[PDB]
Each structure stands twice: as structure tokens, then as C-alpha cells.
């Protein structure tokens, strides 16, 4: 007996289903680590991360909400992106779009 214990049924949860995705190879050219959040507009991340910014337009990381992908200096890795939804209007970040798309 454990007070307030859960009895989670086994299985998996499929995240962000039915949405466009794309894979991109990214490399950290900076001398300091860079960590990117799940809902951050990837196309506007730290300029030290070299990748096809054009492809990542209107996309975010296809990872569970609240998690992140870290890039140590000089690190190179392929990540998967998932398209923004809702109004598909990007406001903020580095201020490169500030509107729909």
C-alpha cells in the first residue's frame, strides 16, 4: 500500500501526430553550450548553430513538451522538427518574422 500511488497502464503515447516534420543536421560552431527548448522557433536559435535555417522556418523540435536538446561546443547531430500549428504566427525570439508563417 502506497498513499496516492499511480497505476499507469502500460504502453506509449504518440506525440504531435498528423503534422509535417523534417530532419536537419545541426552543428554548434560556438565555444559555449547551447540548449534549445521544445517550442522554440528553431529557425531563430543561437546564430552559432549552423544548419539550413530556411528549412526550419515555422518549425520547432519534435520532442515531448518541456524537454530540450543540448549542443556542446563543436557538437553535430541530426534533429527532427515538427511544424507550428494554430495561427502559424511567429512573434518574438530574435524578431526575424514577427507575423504569420
Amino acid at each position: 500500500m502506497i498513499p496516492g500511488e499511480y497505476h499507469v497502464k502500460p504502453g506509449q503515447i504518440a506525440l504531435n501526430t498528423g503534422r509535417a516534420t523534417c530532419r536537419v543536421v545541426v552543428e554548434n560552431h560556438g565555444d559555449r553550450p547551447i540548449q534549445v527548448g521544445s517550442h522554440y522557433h528553431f529557425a531563430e536559435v543561437n546564430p552559432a548553430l549552423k544548419f539550413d535555417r530556411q528549412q526550419a522556418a515555422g518549425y520547432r523540435l519534435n520532442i515531448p513538451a518541456g524537454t530540450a536538446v543540448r549542443f556542446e561546443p563543436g557538437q553535430k547531430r541530426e534533429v527532427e522538427l515538427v511544424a507550428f500549428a494554430g495561427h502559424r504566427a511567429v512573434f518574438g525570439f530574435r524578431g526575424e518574422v514577427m507575423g504569420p508563417l
Partner: protein
């Protein structure tokens, strides 16, 4: 991508199909629905989702909520679901999916710069309790009650005076005015009851016009058919509620005479089992009538090994009886019957009794209304198994039936359901956050009117709020003017019209009662059973349709020694 169910529950709390144990009881709930879109859940913290342009939008204050309770597991009479809760203007705005419509799908609760966040992932959220049997013996009761999870208190009294020790009557215009003024200082919603024991209508009307939302007929002030009829006549014309404590002595007649005097008119019967007062030994038969809204006081809930031993002396002190006067003690074994005490538990499980209350410091414990209601549910599951209404392998229906007893039903009974009683849009944001392991025992957060009024707090000088000693301390929602803005003083329609609030210079928000006369047994959510119940005059045995109703006394209960220091 993909995430396992276990990891998912650890991050955002349980989802559809997952079950959760209530404290250390045998009651299990199962998430019936989840309003989120997988992968789009909002979370707060360093590098999380709720950040500018991401989970937070660019809308103005008027277009977003003031407070959002993320990933909450709602337990209410209407469902046990997973959702985000939006709070705006001190009231429940919506139950849905929170976020930023700019980049997220299905957002119904918009988060913007003007939005505060309460992380409810892994917690159970419920409406604040409502205790309709408070004796204002001391102001300290409000804090005790608030800490337990009760956000509204209905009753009466003037302090530690004999009248209040035994009854919940706030006698007359002067004391009513005084208590209404004193109420602005308390962090709970309040409504007062006046003394309804009089056979002259104008004496009652004055009190209602003074501000009370109900009248109590108590045998200590004489619960005669004449007084009962008088109070009910005035109640019928002023749309206020009547609470009864019948003639235990059978001095003016038996239970059937009292029922006759009531004449099918709406009335709330206090401690219907009888231990706390009522025609000996069959006042319990009242729960069979359509116009009766029956409640229990907590010392008899649930039937345990020490229940009887304790009552004998508790009764005396409360009602100012003399242990040396034969007649004063003679009606002890007449008021305390193992038979009705055992039956009461079952009648609750069946939906025959619709409310639970305390009867604070007058044969009741103010901080144990929620705690004892769940102990009954536990003992009933253990002894009787699943309810005929249960579906699936959970106790979901039993949980909805019991939570309604100290939430929506007390609210319907006193004509305040339009303001509080449940987690529904438009209602005041009186919410309680519970950790599953402390459900019904010790709350994580108590919200009043959209502001946290009390919560456990650690070392004030610590680097974080978690270090010991951790104990309940008043928060901003319980401070001066913020308090006034987050609490409600319920008045009678007459008092509101007379300008009582302006005359007494009340500082809190005002709410008016209505619909007290139209409610009936059938309106009690999940507790509308009108059983063909009888009580044997000699043996005191309770029978429904001829079958014997009874239960066994518990030796050990959950939500007891595992949680309390004393």
C-alpha cells in the same frame, strides 16, 4: 515523437486509463478523459513551454486568463478528467487546453503576459468545501476549516456564549450586524443564520431583513410545531432556508407531528441520524421525504470502535445538561444509539443522506468534514463493495457521489450554488490543490477568489520555500483588502435591497441567496434516494423495505495516524 506512459505520467501527471489511489484508502479513481493534445502540453520552468512567443501569447490582459492551473486532474461531481483550468476576474473562466493560439492547436485557455501559473501536474484539483453547520464559537475556526479545504462557512453565533455553544443562531439585528462586520476579517465565504424559534413572524422578518440567509429551529430554544410553522411561513416569503434540530424529548409530539407541522415545505434537517439532536429514536426516518434535505454531522462518521464511548460526555457539555439530574442523563441512551449510527453510514453510501457537515465545537469537528466523508466511502467500499452504478474497475461513481455531499449539495440547499459549490465556468474560483498522497487530509494549495489564501510554507528565511519546518501560514489572499476582494458575504435578498451592506459599511463582495424554497430531495446530486425506511421504537433497528440496514465498527481508519503529529 513517442514517450512511454510511465514517463509521461511522471512529467505531466496521469492520463486516460491511469488510476490513482486516494491517500491511503482503498478508493481508486481512473482518468475518464483528457482535454490535451499530446505533445502540446504547457509546462512552466527554466527552458519549458510557457515562454514569450511559445506557450505564451501576445494578447492583452482582456484576452487571456489571469491564472492557469496546468495539467490538473479534476475530481468533481460531473467528472474525473485531466485538463488545464483558466481563472479570470476571480472566477472560473474555462476548463480546457491552455497555451498560445499563435503556434498551438486547440487552445481554449489563452496564456499571455498577464497570466500567472500554478503547476498542477500530478495533483488533484477540487472545488472548495462548504460547511453548512458552523457555530461561531470562536474566529479561529475559519483558519482551521480553510486549511482542511473548506472555503465557505454557513452557520451562526456571537462567540463563546451559551446560546452559540449549543445553537447556530445569531440572535437579532444587533448581533447579526456585528457578525456581518466581523466577517470581513475572515478568509472564507460566509452566510449567517438567525434564531428562528418564535411564533411571531415579524420577529423573524427583522432578522432576515438584518442580513441572515437562513433561520435555525433548535430544540434548545423550543422546536415546537408553532415555531416550526412560523419559521417556514417567513422562509417561504423571503426565499431563505430553514435548518432543523427537532424535539428529541417528543415534548410537543413525535417525529410524525414535526413532519406534519413542516407540511411538505422545504427544510434542511441537521444531523438527521439523531445523535446530534432530533426526535428519539426515529428522526432518521425524515430522509424518506421529498421536501427534506438531510445532512450528517461528523462525529458519527464513520462508525468506529470508540464512537459510542466518546459521545456520552460530549452531549452533556454541548447542550448544558446536568449529569446529576436524572432527566438530563436519561435522554443520553435515547439520543446515542449504536443502531442508527451504524445505519447512517450505509444510508450515505446509498444516497439517502445528501450532505455532510461538522457542527463545529458543538458535537462536531471543524477541520474534519472532508476527511471523515472519505473515511465513510472507504469503509463502505470495504464492507459493501462496488455500487450498483459503478462502471469499469474504479470507484469513480462512489467518488462523485461523496464529493457532492460537501460541495454542490450544501450549495444547492442554501441557495448559493449560483456562486460556489463546483468547478464550473462563471463560479467563484475557490479551488483546492491536493497531492494524491495527502488527498482529503492536507492540501498543497488553497485558492480563494483567484488568490492563494493559505498553503504550507517552509522556512521564511530559506533559499527555497521547501525547507522545514513546513506548516500552514496565511497568504496574500487572506490579507486586508485583497481578502475583501476574494471573499463573499451572502445576504438575503431583503437585506441586499435594504442597503445593509452600505449601512454596515461592509468591505467584501456581496452575493445574494435565492432558490432555497424550490430545492427538493430529487435535486441533490447523486444523493436523491427516498428510501422506505423504518425504525423500531423498542430495538432502534433501522430497516429499508423490511431489510435490516447496519454496518460494522472500524478499529483502524485511513487518513488518521499516518498523517497527524497528535
Amino acid at each position: 515523437s513517442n514517450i512511454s506512459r510511465q514517463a509521461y505520467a511522471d512529467m505531466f501527471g496521469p492520463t486516460v486509463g491511469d488510476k490513482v489511489r486516494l491517500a491511503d484508502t482503498e478508493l481508486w479513481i481512473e482518468v475518464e478523459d483528457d482535454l490535451t493534445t499530446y505533445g502540446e502540453e504547457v509546462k512552466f520552468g527554466g527552458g519549458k513551454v510557457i515562454r514569450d512567443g511559445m506557450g505564451q501569447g501576445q494578447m492583452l490582459a482582456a484576452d487571456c486568463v489571469d491564472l492557469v492551473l496546468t495539467n490538473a486532474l479534476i475530481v468533481d461531481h460531473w467528472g474525473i478528467v485531466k485538463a488545464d483550468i483558466g481563472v479570470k476576474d476571480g472566477r472560473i473562466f474555462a476548463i480546457g487546453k491552455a497555451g498560445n493560439p499563435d503556434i498551438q492547436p486547440n487552445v481554449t485557455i489563452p496564456i499571455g503576459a498577464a497570466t500567472e501559473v500554478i503547476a498542477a501536474e500530478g495533483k488533484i484539483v477540487t472545488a472548495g468545501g462548504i460547511d453548512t453547520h458552523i457555530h461561531w464559537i470562536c474566529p479561529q475556526q475559519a483558519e482551521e476549516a480553510l486549511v482542511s479545504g473548506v472555503t465557505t462557512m454557513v452557520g451562526g453565533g456571537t462567540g463563546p456564549a451559551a446560546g452559540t455553544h449549543a445553537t447556530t443562531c445569531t440572535p437579532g439585528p444587533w448581533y447579526i450586524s456585528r457578525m456581518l462586520q466581523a466577517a470581513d476579517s475572515l478568509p472564507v465565504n460566509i452566510g449567517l443564520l438567525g434564531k428562528g424559534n418564535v411564533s411571531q413572524p415579524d420577529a423573524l422578518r427583522e432578522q432576515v431583513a438584518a442580513g441572515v440567509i437562513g433561520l435555525e429551529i433548535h430544540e434548545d430554544w423550543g422546536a415546537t410545531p408553532a415555531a416550526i410553522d412560523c419559521a417556514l411561513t417567513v422562509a417561504d416569503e423571503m426565499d431563505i432556508q430553514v435548518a432543523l434540530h427537532s424535539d428529541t424529548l417528543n415534548e410537543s409530539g413525535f417525529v410524525e407531528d414535526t413532519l406534519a407541522a413542516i407540511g411538505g415545505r422545504t427544510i434542511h434537517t441537521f444531523h438527521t441520524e439523531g445523535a446530534g439532536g432530533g426526535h428519539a429514536p426515529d428522526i432518521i426516518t425524515a430522509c424518506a421525504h421529498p421536501n427534506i434535505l438531510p445532512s450528517s454531522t461528523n462525529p458519527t462518521l464513520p462508525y468506529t470502535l470508540n464512537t459510542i464511548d466518546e459521545h456520552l460526555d460530549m452531549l452533556m457539555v454541548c447542550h448544558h445538561l446536568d449529569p446529576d439530574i436524572a432527566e438530563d442523563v436519561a435522554f443520553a441512551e435515547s439520543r446515542i444509539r449504536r443502531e442508527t449510527i451504524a445505519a447512517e453510514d450505509v444510508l450515505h453510501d446509498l444516497g439517502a443522506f445528501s450532505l455532510t457537515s461538522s457542527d463545529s465545537q458543538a458535537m462536531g469537528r471543524v477541520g474534519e468534514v472532508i476527511l471523515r466523508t472519505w473515511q465513510v466511502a472507504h469503509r463502505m467500499k470495504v464492507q459493501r463493495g462496488a455500487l450498483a452504478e459503478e462502471t469499469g474497475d474504479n470507484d469513480n461513481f462512489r467518488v462523485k457521489r461523496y464529493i457532492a455531499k460537501y460541495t454542490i449539495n450544501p450549495a444547492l440547499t442554501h441557495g448559493i450554488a449560483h456562486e460556489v459549490g463546483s468547478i464550473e465556468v462563471g463560479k467563484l474560483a475557490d479551488l483546492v490543490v491536493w497531492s494524491p498522497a495527502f488527498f482529503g487530509v492536507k492540501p498543497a494549495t488553497v485558492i480563494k477568489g483567484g488568490m492563494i489564501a493559505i498553503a504550507p510554507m517552509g522556512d521564511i528565511n530559506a533559499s527555497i520555500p521547501t525547507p522545514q519546518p513546513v506548516h500552514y501560514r496565511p497568504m496574500f489572499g487572506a490579507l486586508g483588502s485583497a481578502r475583501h476582494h476574494c471573499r463573499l458575504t451572502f445576504l438575503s435578498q431583503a437585506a441586499a435591497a435594504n442597503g445593509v451592506a452600505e449601512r454596515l459599511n461592509l468591505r467584501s463582495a456581496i452575493a445574494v441567496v435565492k432558490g432555497c424554497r424550490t430545492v427538493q430531495k430529487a435535486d441533490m446530486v447523486h444523493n436523491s434516494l427516498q428510501p422506505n425506511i423504518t425504525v423500531d421504537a423498542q430495538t432502534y433497528e433501522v430497516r429499508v423495505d423490511g431489510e435490516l440496514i447496519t454496518s460494522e465498527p472500524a478499529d483502524v481508519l485511513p487518513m488518521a495516524q499516518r498523517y497527524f503529529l497528535f
